[PDB]
Design a binder for this molecule. Sequence first.
Ligand SMILES: Cc1cccc2c(=O)[nH]c(-c3ccc(CN4CCCC4)cc3)cc12
Ligand SMILES: [Zn+2]
Length: 208
Amino acid sequence: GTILIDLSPDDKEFQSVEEEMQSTVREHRDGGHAGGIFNRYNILKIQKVCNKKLWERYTHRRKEVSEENHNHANERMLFHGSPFVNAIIHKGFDERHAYIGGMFGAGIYFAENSSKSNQYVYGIGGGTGCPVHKDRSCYICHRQLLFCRVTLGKSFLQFSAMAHSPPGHHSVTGRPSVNGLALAEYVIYRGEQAYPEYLITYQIMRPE
Ligand SMILES: Cc1cccc2c(=O)[nH]c(-c3ccc(CN4CCCC4)cc3)cc12
Ligand SMILES: [Zn+2]
């Protein structure tokens, strides 16, 4: 049921998505070990992901959460990186997309920083890097990230120096608590709480 519609670079939707990708790059504490060394991306393509069934699954859950939270879904647009992005766009998120060893328990993780999600495109800690060159900092191979609509509802705030949500909450927020420049990370424990809205194909760029 999934179709991918290419956005034109002249389209304001393309432009606002590219800006969120570019403007949320930061330096990482591993100096680029996991995701590579770069300050920006070369964006090759942005596709809209269209799946009626998966959309209806998202909006149904969004309505449940909202009615549990004074009519407030607390919906965000967040990045997700994974070796399985091509399964996600066809089948949606579910328990097999969870990060079992994540710092906030076995759930599905999303980032405000695009460069954080970039660290997981080739697997946990960047795995062994690109499949062609075995290079975590490959500047040639094409990478893909998702930019997703995510329902957080009432989020449990964890100050930070599938399982269940903490009782009375619909998600967990990982608040950066040492690195003053890092943006938040978020965890959901139900795959129906995210819809993978854009597929972004890119390369990381070598600093000049
Ligand atoms: C911890 C964290 C913070 C912020 C963003 C992300 C993210 O985008 N992906 C991931 C991530 C981690 C692992 C996996 C895939 N594992 C591979 C076997 C199934 C789960 C997929 C995505 C983690 C993450
Ligand atoms: Zn490569």
